[PDB]
Every structure is written in structure tokens, then in C-alpha cells.
């Protein structure tokens, strides 16, 4: 709150989470997802403030990622419908493994 206000990255108003299908939030620093409701999020995982991470989405189901809480808590998400699993959610991941370099920086 020194210069404006937060920076989001993306935001997907649909997901499908083996829990519940939801809107997914993404923000520079956190994973944020809520459910039908106004332009926010029910919940929110500051990246760093998790700390596991798997890309299964490749040639997978229909786009799924998977992230840990360095705590003992996961983070499984997905989107897909009956023609919008692709591009649209490949590159919410892709932003998932572009935000990945801000908290855990992979190579040089």
C-alpha cells in the first residue's frame, strides 16, 4: 500500500476443483479461489506461503495443477468444460509457472 493498491495477475470465474467448481483468483503472490458470488475470492494461498508444486496438465485430463501449503494442506485445481478446458486454462497455468519464479526461482 505504498505506491497503490495490490496487483493481481489473472482471474478465472470458472474452475472445477474435485471439491466444488468455483471462480479462481490469481494473484502475483497468492491463489485465490471463490465460488458464485461478487469479484472476489473465498480464499487466497500467498504462494510463499505454500511451498509444493506439480504440473500435470500437459496431456493430461483437462488441465489440472497442483500446489502444497508448507503446511500439510494441498491445493488441486482444475478447469474444463464441455470445450473450454484448453487454451483459457493452459495459460492460468502457464501463469502458475510464471509467478512460480517470484517465490522459488528455478533456473538462473
Not at 474435485?18 to 502475483?28: E, I, N, P, S
Not at 511451498?51 to 496431456?59: F, R
Not at 503446511?71 to 473450454?84: I, P, Y
Amino acid at each position: 500500500m505504498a505506491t497503490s493498491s495490490e496487483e493481481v495477475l489473472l482471474i478465472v470465474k470458472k474452475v472445477r476443483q474435485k471439491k466444488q467448481d468455483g471462480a479462481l483468483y490469481l494473484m502475483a503472490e497468492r491463489i485465490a479461489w471463490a465460488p458464485e458470488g461478487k469479484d472476489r475470492f473465498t480464499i487466497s494461498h500467498m504462494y510463499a506461503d505454500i511451498k509444493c508444486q506439480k504440473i500435470s496438465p500437459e496431456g493430461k485430463a483437462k488441465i489440472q495443477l497442483q500446489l502444497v501449503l508448507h503446511a500439510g494442506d494441498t491445493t488441486n485445481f482444475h478447469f474444463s468444460n464441455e470445450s473450454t478446458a484448453v487454451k483459457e486454462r493452459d495459460a492460468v497455468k502457464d501463469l502458475l509457472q510464471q509467478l512460480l519464479p517470484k517465490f522459488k526461482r528455478k533456473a538462473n
